[PDB]
Every structure is written in C-alpha cells, then in structure tokens.
Design a protein around this motif. Structure first.
Motif, short mmCIF file in Angstrom:
data_model
loop_
_atom_site.label_atom_id
_atom_site.label_comp_id
_atom_site.label_asym_id
_atom_site.label_seq_id
_atom_site.Cartn_x
_atom_site.Cartn_y
_atom_site.Cartn_z
N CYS A 1 2.80 6.96 -4.48
CA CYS A 1 2.84 7.11 -5.95
C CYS A 1 1.67 8.49 -6.25
CB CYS A 1 1.95 6.35 -6.95
SG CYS A 1 1.72 6.16 -8.45
N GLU A 2 0.57 8.36 -5.11
CA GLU A 2 -0.69 8.98 -5.42
C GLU A 2 0.47 10.87 -5.00
OE1 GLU A 2 -4.78 8.64 -3.84
OE2 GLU A 2 -3.96 6.71 -4.09
N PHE B 1 -4.30 -5.04 -6.59
CA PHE B 1 -3.80 -6.21 -5.34
C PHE B 1 -4.58 -6.06 -4.51
CE2 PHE B 1 -2.63 -4.44 -0.68
CZ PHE B 1 -1.85 -6.21 -0.58
N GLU B 2 -5.50 -5.74 -3.91
CA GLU B 2 -6.72 -4.93 -3.29
C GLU B 2 -7.64 -6.59 -3.16
OE1 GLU B 2 -6.01 -4.13 -0.80
OE2 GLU B 2 -4.84 -1.64 -0.63
N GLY C 1 -1.29 3.39 -10.82
CA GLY C 1 -1.01 3.60 -9.32
C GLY C 1 -2.38 3.16 -8.64
N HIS C 2 -3.12 3.85 -9.63
CA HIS C 2 -5.12 3.72 -9.19
C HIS C 2 -5.33 2.12 -9.46
CE1 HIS C 2 -6.51 7.34 -7.48
NE2 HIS C 2 -5.78 7.87 -7.96
N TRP D 1 -5.89 -9.20 -2.69
CA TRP D 1 -5.92 -9.97 -0.73
C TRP D 1 -7.13 -10.23 -0.48
CZ3 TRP D 1 -1.29 -9.45 1.56
CH2 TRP D 1 -1.39 -9.34 3.12
N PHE E 1 1.54 2.19 -3.47
CA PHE E 1 0.48 3.10 -4.16
C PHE E 1 0.38 5.05 -3.26
CE2 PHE E 1 -0.46 -1.07 -4.53
CZ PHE E 1 0.33 -1.43 -6.30
N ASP E 2 0.54 5.18 -2.09
CA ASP E 2 0.11 6.32 -1.35
C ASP E 2 1.87 6.79 -1.37
OD1 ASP E 2 -1.74 5.15 0.00
OD2 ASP E 2 -0.91 4.62 2.05
N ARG F 1 -3.83 -0.38 -7.21
CA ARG F 1 -4.03 -0.42 -6.20
C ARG F 1 -4.89 -1.68 -6.04
NH1 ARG F 1 -3.98 2.70 -1.73
NH2 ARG F 1 -3.09 4.60 -2.62
N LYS F 2 -5.73 -1.15 -7.09
CA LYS F 2 -7.32 -2.22 -7.15
C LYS F 2 -7.06 -3.93 -7.67
CE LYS F 2 -11.78 -2.04 -7.78
NZ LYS F 2 -12.97 -2.01 -6.68
N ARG G 1 0.86 -0.96 0.29
CA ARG G 1 0.12 0.37 0.40
C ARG G 1 1.27 1.35 0.37
NH1 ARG G 1 -3.88 -3.53 4.33
NH2 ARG G 1 -5.18 -4.63 2.55
#
Length: 115
Positions: free
Chosen positions: A85-86, A106-107, A99-100, A110, A82-83, A103-104, A79
């Motif tokens: 990155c943003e 990965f989540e 990055g968006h 998970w 990605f954080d 993250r999608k 995370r």
C-alpha cells in the motif's frame, strides 16, 4: 543446539488467535482497499511495480488451508499488505491513510495478543 532446547512456548492457540485478528481486520471500516486482490488488468503499474501482491482474502485462504507454518509467516503477509500500500499510494490519499490506520490497528492487536 542438539538435545538442548529452550522451554516450549505454547503455540496451540496461534491458529485461532490469528483467525480472530484477521476477522477484526476484515470488519474494520478502513479495510476496503485490502479485502480483495488488486485487479492487475485494471490498475496500471501494479503488476510491474508490486512484486508480491497480498490482500486479506488471500491471507484468509492461506490461513484456512495450512499454508502458514507459524505465526510470524502470518504477520509477514499482513505487513506485506501495508508495505505494498505505501509503495503504490500517496500518504495523503484515502487508500494511503487507510493503510496507515490498518497497520496501526494490526500492530496493537499483535502485541496485545502475543507479546
């Protein structure tokens, strides 16, 4: 508390399963901004602005060498990628969008693997 334990969640496959997730992140076509450490000599601002740089290769080495005490510390570093990155990239940039998307991706993996 003392001598009072919730039932033991089997965590014995966590290492292998994080590794597979990480492999899938490494091979996604939008992984390219995240595969290696951001070059702190060549990217103005990065060093000062991003207090805790993180990337996939660095997660991979930490994973391979027993530096994640548990699967939540692994999810935190992912995370963090990605954080960061943003923090540094406009949403409407190729890297921002990457990055968006990642993250999608990965989540979902998970949740489907562990929840």
């Amino acid at each position: 508390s003392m001598s009072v334990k919730k039932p033991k969640r089997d965590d014995s496959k966590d290492l292998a399963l994080c590794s597979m997730i990480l492999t899938e992140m490494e091979t996604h076509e939008d992984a390219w901004p995240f595969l290696l450490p951001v070059n702190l000599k060549l990217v103005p601002g990065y060093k000062k602005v991003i207090k805790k740089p993180m990337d996939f290769s660095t997660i991979r080495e930490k994973l391979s060498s027993g530096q994640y005490p548990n699967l939540e510390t692994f999810a935190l570093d992912v995370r963090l990628v990605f954080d960061n990155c943003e923090t540094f990239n406009e949403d409407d940039s190729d890297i921002g969008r990457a990055g968006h998307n990642m993250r999608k991706y990965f989540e979902k993996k998970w949740t489907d693997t562990f929840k």
